[PDB]
Symmetry: D2
Subunit: 354 residues, 4 copies
Amino acid sequence: IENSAIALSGIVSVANNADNRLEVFGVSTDSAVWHNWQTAPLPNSSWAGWNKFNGVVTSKPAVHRNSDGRLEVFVRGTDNALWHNWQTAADTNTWSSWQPLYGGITSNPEVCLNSDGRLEVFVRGSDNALWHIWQTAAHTNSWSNWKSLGGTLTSNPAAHLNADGRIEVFARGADNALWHIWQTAAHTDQWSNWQSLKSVITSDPVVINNCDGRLEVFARGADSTLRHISQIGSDSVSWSNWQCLDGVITSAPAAVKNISGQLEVFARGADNTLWRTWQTSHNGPWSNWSSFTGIIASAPTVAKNSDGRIEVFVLGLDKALWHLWQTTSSTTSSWTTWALIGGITLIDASVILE
Amino acid sequence: IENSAIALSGIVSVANNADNRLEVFGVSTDSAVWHNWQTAPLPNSSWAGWNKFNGVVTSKPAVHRNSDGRLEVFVRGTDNALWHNWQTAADTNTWSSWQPLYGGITSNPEVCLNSDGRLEVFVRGSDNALWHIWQTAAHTNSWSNWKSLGGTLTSNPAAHLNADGRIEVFARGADNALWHIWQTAAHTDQWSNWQSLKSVITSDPVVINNCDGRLEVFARGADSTLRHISQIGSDSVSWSNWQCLDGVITSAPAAVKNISGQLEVFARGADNTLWRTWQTSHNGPWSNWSSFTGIIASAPTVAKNSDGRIEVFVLGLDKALWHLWQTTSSTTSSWTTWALIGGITLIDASVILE
Amino acid sequence: IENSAIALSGIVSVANNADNRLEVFGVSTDSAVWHNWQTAPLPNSSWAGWNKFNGVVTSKPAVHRNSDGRLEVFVRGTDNALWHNWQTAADTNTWSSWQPLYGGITSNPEVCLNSDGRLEVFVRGSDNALWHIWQTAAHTNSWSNWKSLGGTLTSNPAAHLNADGRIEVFARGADNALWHIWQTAAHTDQWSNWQSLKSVITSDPVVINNCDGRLEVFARGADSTLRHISQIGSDSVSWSNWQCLDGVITSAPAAVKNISGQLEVFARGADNTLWRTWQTSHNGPWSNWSSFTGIIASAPTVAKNSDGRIEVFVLGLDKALWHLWQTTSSTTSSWTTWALIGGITLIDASVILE
Amino acid sequence: IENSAIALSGIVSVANNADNRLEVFGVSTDSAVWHNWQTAPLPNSSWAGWNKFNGVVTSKPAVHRNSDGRLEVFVRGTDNALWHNWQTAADTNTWSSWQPLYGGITSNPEVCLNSDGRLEVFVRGSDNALWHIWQTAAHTNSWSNWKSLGGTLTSNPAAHLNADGRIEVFARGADNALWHIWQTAAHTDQWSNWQSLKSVITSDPVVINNCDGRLEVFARGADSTLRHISQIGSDSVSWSNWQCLDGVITSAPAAVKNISGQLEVFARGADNTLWRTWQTSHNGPWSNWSSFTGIIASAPTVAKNSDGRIEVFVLGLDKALWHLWQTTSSTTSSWTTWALIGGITLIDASVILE
Ligand SMILES: C[C@@H]1O[C@@H](O)[C@@H](O)[C@H](O)[C@@H]1O
Ligand SMILES: C[C@@H]1O[C@@H](O)[C@@H](O)[C@H](O)[C@@H]1O
Ligand SMILES: C[C@@H]1O[C@@H](O)[C@@H](O)[C@H](O)[C@@H]1O
Ligand SMILES: C[C@@H]1O[C@@H](O)[C@@H](O)[C@H](O)[C@@H]1O
Ligand SMILES: C[C@@H]1O[C@@H](O)[C@@H](O)[C@H](O)[C@@H]1O
Ligand SMILES: C[C@@H]1O[C@@H](O)[C@@H](O)[C@H](O)[C@@H]1O
Ligand SMILES: C[C@@H]1O[C@@H](O)[C@@H](O)[C@H](O)[C@@H]1O
Ligand SMILES: C[C@@H]1O[C@@H](O)[C@@H](O)[C@H](O)[C@@H]1O
Ligand SMILES: C[C@@H]1O[C@@H](O)[C@@H](O)[C@H](O)[C@@H]1O
Ligand SMILES: C[C@@H]1O[C@@H](O)[C@@H](O)[C@H](O)[C@@H]1O
Ligand SMILES: C[C@@H]1O[C@@H](O)[C@@H](O)[C@H](O)[C@@H]1O
Ligand SMILES: C[C@@H]1O[C@@H](O)[C@@H](O)[C@H](O)[C@@H]1O
Ligand SMILES: C[C@@H]1O[C@H](O)[C@@H](O)[C@H](O)[C@@H]1O
Ligand SMILES: C[C@@H]1O[C@H](O)[C@@H](O)[C@H](O)[C@@H]1O
Ligand SMILES: C[C@@H]1O[C@H](O)[C@@H](O)[C@H](O)[C@@H]1O
Ligand SMILES: C[C@@H]1O[C@H](O)[C@@H](O)[C@H](O)[C@@H]1O
């Protein structure tokens, strides 16, 4: 691989409804967003069936739950502007249809929820800088004007809350290194300057929090292995060295915190199957990669059910959505084999960044 | 103290709104519930002022946020039945007024949110058993019939979710020991038998989860010191030995997990001031108690703000509500001194259990 | 029990030879020290048989291995002075016979090895102060003059090295609280003042180091349960609060670090059997006490074999020495039942402190 | 670098005497072993001066302390056989002179102390297999016959005790991967088969134990960065995945456990200065490399003083021995600058393995 490569992304975006039922959003061959949901919040639940949102889209959809429980989806439209669509009430399958937020978008959208309940969206703009727009009141369809945070982005952005409520945003820069920028006060339009975390990454960054608060960032490196870095202090400026794990991965990674508080990472492996690694103890060393049977055609998307059980979604070779899950709420649980969520086929609508 | 004593409780119940603004509920000299809220989700925010709910009540109010963000308050009425009252929309100060759930109540109510989004209420009944009632659909004013879980209670119940979504309930039994009972499958009406955790407690139990998932229970013991016990496995049946901490406390304890993932406990101390202890490292030993200036007249009630800062509420000697908070989002932060939330005086409406 | 009680002590002192074979020292009905040793450094080894040192003694013997591998035993004589006796070569059963160190002794002796290879002995003196005497060159029969460290002792002293090489000494004071005093520079005659750790203890203190360097002290408390306190910093002045564990113990405790780095404590329990508790995780909570069959008549003495397996020695109701051990080098290993090390009967020669 | 490279080694071997004074052994331009020692066991001590052992040698010397405190040095002679030389008494500068152990040696010797007090030596033999020879009684000049453990070695061996007393040996194999072999019972001539740990290493392996017992192995990888792997169970067969740390190193690494129980690694960095990294918390992430001023011409050799302070030895550009050390017994201590241990110049006598 080359330094500027961006690894294959997940094929759906997934959210938990207010009652924790999973709901997935993807793009079909008609270039429209379709969605499907569990009928009850357990991995062995039936799914409702694929339902279409009218409208042609030009990016992967991003979804987040509002602080009042309503899901809200963001996508790039045929006019290269940002559009969004929301449930009109929590846990209800009635939606607003696509409404305009304007702007000029050159990446997939990334959404975060501030700790004061306001959604905030991050995108690469037409000048390749990071731009953002936010709800001006919690869970309300009232939005700010577009504002630039500068920089030069060569990946999609990834945003996450610090333990103290400050949003921090990660993105690859013009030198193919990982850069970041952060709120200097929680849920406030006061931001740091851009700072480099130095390495060279060949996927979008993936960010998760560990239980002692500190952010941990995962990405594929220049040698196509997983690498990761962590905050070691109480601020956004103190980071560990980068560490890599042996084993060639062929997609973006996906990270999840299991119900024992340890981190797990899933990625497509060198043999195009799903690979999994987990921390063997608190902060501990990482297990050897363990592989699941079955060739997959996307990065994994990983979610947790209402009983803590991990569930993984992938694109199959038939271009349909498949999933598997843990049989018990236990870190050593066995796993099911791939099952089909049939009814449509999916395409990768990710914005091509170069 | 005697084995059957129940330590002084907190004077208000506190919840975070959907936008994380704190809101407190207490009972005034007119025997009505009054409430007050931050105008912005920061500890140095102004408060809106005390507002009254019409209706005479006969217990401490319990409050919980629904899975759609709406606060909902539960109280015993003049007819000894359960009543409730809810925000009609998230982050809005419009309420439904008191509506009946019937039953016969002989304790303060305790509320929990199941991991499928349904509130569930636990009370001691007229036969001294544990009874419960639940929403039949998430965040909906549709409730089940009353059902008994048996047992004999001599304290108020305390409920908490396990990491796998199973509710577990703790209460003092007829032998003054701590007993517990739990769902055997997440958010399902399938329950274990009662089991004893053995000791002798002289306060209501206080339950919190640590980051690696396991529940930890705090209570005052027969010698009037703090004691605690923790889950050591992945189920509800494997517990540590009881440990005590030196230092006489004169109220129920209040526990919180700070933004570094460590536990802290607050209680009124032997000199009637607020005392604080914290874990010095992960699972680590506990610090010596540290005292704050000022005599207090209730147990503390502890909450966290949108930026992670801890805030503590107490009854003052003037029978009004006072609070203090951390100056920074940091475990070593200094603290403010007590400030008044003036406008009404408060009474302790806790149900007298004997 | 009363605040000034001193719990029953162990009946033998145990050391590892240079080749790690265990060797035990006790006092028989002739008031002489006898010793016995493993013939190979494994718990299932045969023992050589009881051999006598000529000479009448008036205290429990203390034993330590010199930095050149030779064992050396310290005891009070019929003249109330300190006497000692050493192997003339490592792993050899040829001894020097008792030689005088003079002084006036009113406690059992306590021995420590400085990190520069010099033995140092701590005793209560005729004025009830702490006195000490040391080798002036490593593993050499050249000793200093007696010197006083002051204080007023009401227990035997317990000494241990800090991670930085500073000896720290613990002893009960005139107020029945635990006091301590320490070298302010490693292996130097420069000492702190006495400082109180506050509580009230009813046994000799027992001190061990945990793997992250910090000392942890165990003792029986005024309510006859185990209590413990730990260093929380990098110096001798920063300590945790005291914690107790439920369960009445009827002897001094004995602590050991197992080969997983976790602490275990053994003590005679309320039913006069051997009880064991262990840390369930790093610094973690403590397990419920687990009991072994068989009534015992002393505190346990605990040692580790060359393969890490823990072995416990006690006085039986027949006034003989019994032991049991782990069947495998594993923290969850099963244990053998009590086996006899027959040939003599033993008496408790501990100095009666009041 | 190429897969078969072996990184530059340390220029001296270092041991602690029985009284913990450091003593270093190196080879001078006369091809003889010389040694020098601290006069007192503190890093700021004067050194005695360089003293010569008569005899021409053809390998780097290996040194270990016997279980009776006497140092003993092993080296290859002009006849390609193993020779050794020992202190005749602990802490004494009287030595036996070189005595033969025969055999045919094609690597530097590696020495370990069994947990029953017997030294054991590991070497690559004339057939490129691993061979060993051992004391038949603890700290006694009585040795076994040579015995083969098979395999094919392409590095020097590194040996370490497991927590349960089993020796485990690590060495690079014919495929340039790290292999290992272990005693299946403590201090017994019963060994496992060879097993591969898979990667590709370009230095000798370096092995250390962490406080919870488990071995951790460090080595330079094929991309010239540090990599490491750890035991995750209670046996020798359960290992983590390999992890690398960013940063090009140009020598073998040297590892030490500091007095807080955390691991630190030193290596010559890409700019030919001394680099240091440390674990920021228990098992935690690794710090960025920190560099010391001064170009160095060997790998570091690292030791600990009697007060816990770390001291580092390197070859300077003047071909003399230099060292620096921590100013205080604290993980955050500042460091001195390089100081000269003058009197001879040193050569790298490491056996050239190909
Ligand atoms: C997603 C939206 O779908 C239709 O409404 C188009 O008219 C818009 O341009 C946008 O593409
Ligand atoms: C995102 C960052 O923005 C500017 O700071 C550039 O100088 C960097 O190269 C990077 O692209
Ligand atoms: C990941 C899945 O694995 C197998 O089950 C295939 O039949 C599917 O098409 C898909 O590739
Ligand atoms: C809290 C409620 O307040 C009034 O509505 C009373 O009529 C009810 O009995 C109840 O006490
Ligand atoms: C809550 C418990 O209920 C029954 O099991 C009683 O036997 C116990 O004493 C306890 O009161
Ligand atoms: C806890 C508070 O402390 C002091 O400030 C008093 O003035 C208040 O009345 C209250 O007791
Ligand atoms: C232990 C010693 O034994 C004998 O040598 C006595 O003469 C001494 O007084 C001392 O008691
Ligand atoms: C050992 C200590 O010595 C002195 O400091 C006394 O004042 C204390 O009470 C204690 O006995
Ligand atoms: C601890 C031992 O337990 C039983 O085996 C008795 O027979 C012994 O006398 C001793 O009490
Ligand atoms: C190290 C030894 O030094 C001399 O004694 C030589 O005769 C030996 O062959 C050996 O090299
Ligand atoms: C040390 C090992 O010995 C044998 O097992 C070889 O097959 C391996 O390649 C390796 O060299
Ligand atoms: C490591 C040392 O660093 C400098 O002090 C040089 O003067 C020495 O020769 C040596 O290179
Ligand atoms: C998101 C922003 O929207 C605006 O319309 C553009 O002018 C900016 O370049 C940027 O793309
Ligand atoms: C809560 C339950 O309500 C019912 O009306 C009563 O009959 C029960 O005893 C119990 O009090
Ligand atoms: C140990 C010391 O020995 C001396 O002889 C005595 O004078 C002191 O009081 C003390 O007992
Ligand atoms: C160490 C062993 O010594 C013997 O003499 C040789 O025959 C073997 O090959 C091996 O070198």
